[PDB]
């Protein structure tokens, strides 16, 4: 059935902020993402007669 709901804006999270504490990454990964962009559209002409 059709349901309605308040949408979620994102996950709940936090940062463990403290005046004398830091986080440093110890490992990493390589990620490759894909970005798709239009460059051109259809070229047209019209015979009005």
């Amino acid at each position: 059935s059709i349901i309605a709901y308040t949408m979620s804006l994102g996950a709940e999270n936090s940062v463990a902020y403290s005046n004398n504490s830091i986080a440093i990454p110890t490992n990493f990964t390589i990620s490759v993402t894909t970005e798709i962009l239009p460059v051109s559209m259809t070229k047209t002409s019209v015979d009005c007669t």
């Binding site: 463990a16 504490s21 830091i22 440093i24 990454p25 110890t26 990620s31 490759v32 798709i36």
Partner: protein
């Protein structure tokens, strides 16, 4: 080239990209570096040595349960803190939280 613009060439730190063609457009494959596993370390702005204040040259002062090391910001790789990895300016009575 390599862009330093955030999220311009994809999420993460940009390394490189490769174009691919498509009908009426271009598709880019963006290769980026993403920090992964991480740890909680103690820090301090500077080290107090003989009364002089030592600042990290390229990195942060980081400490495990018993020892202080200096590391590059984006990857944990602890070095012995030496006079080569630091610069000296000012003294122990000025920097807040100097250890």
């Amino acid at each position: 080239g390599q862009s330093k613009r955030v999220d311009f060439c994809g999420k993460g730190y940009h390394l490189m990209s490769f174009p691919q063609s498509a009908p009426h457009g271009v598709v880019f494959l963006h290769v980026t570096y993403v920090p992964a596993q991480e740890k909680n370390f103690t820090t301090a702005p500077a080290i107090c040595h003989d009364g002089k204040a030592h600042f990290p040259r390229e990195g942060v002062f980081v400490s495990n349960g018993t020892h202080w090391f200096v590391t590059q910001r984006n990857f944990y790789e602890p070095q012995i803190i030496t006079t080569d990895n630091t610069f000296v300016s000012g003294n122990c009575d000025v920097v807040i939280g100097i250890v």
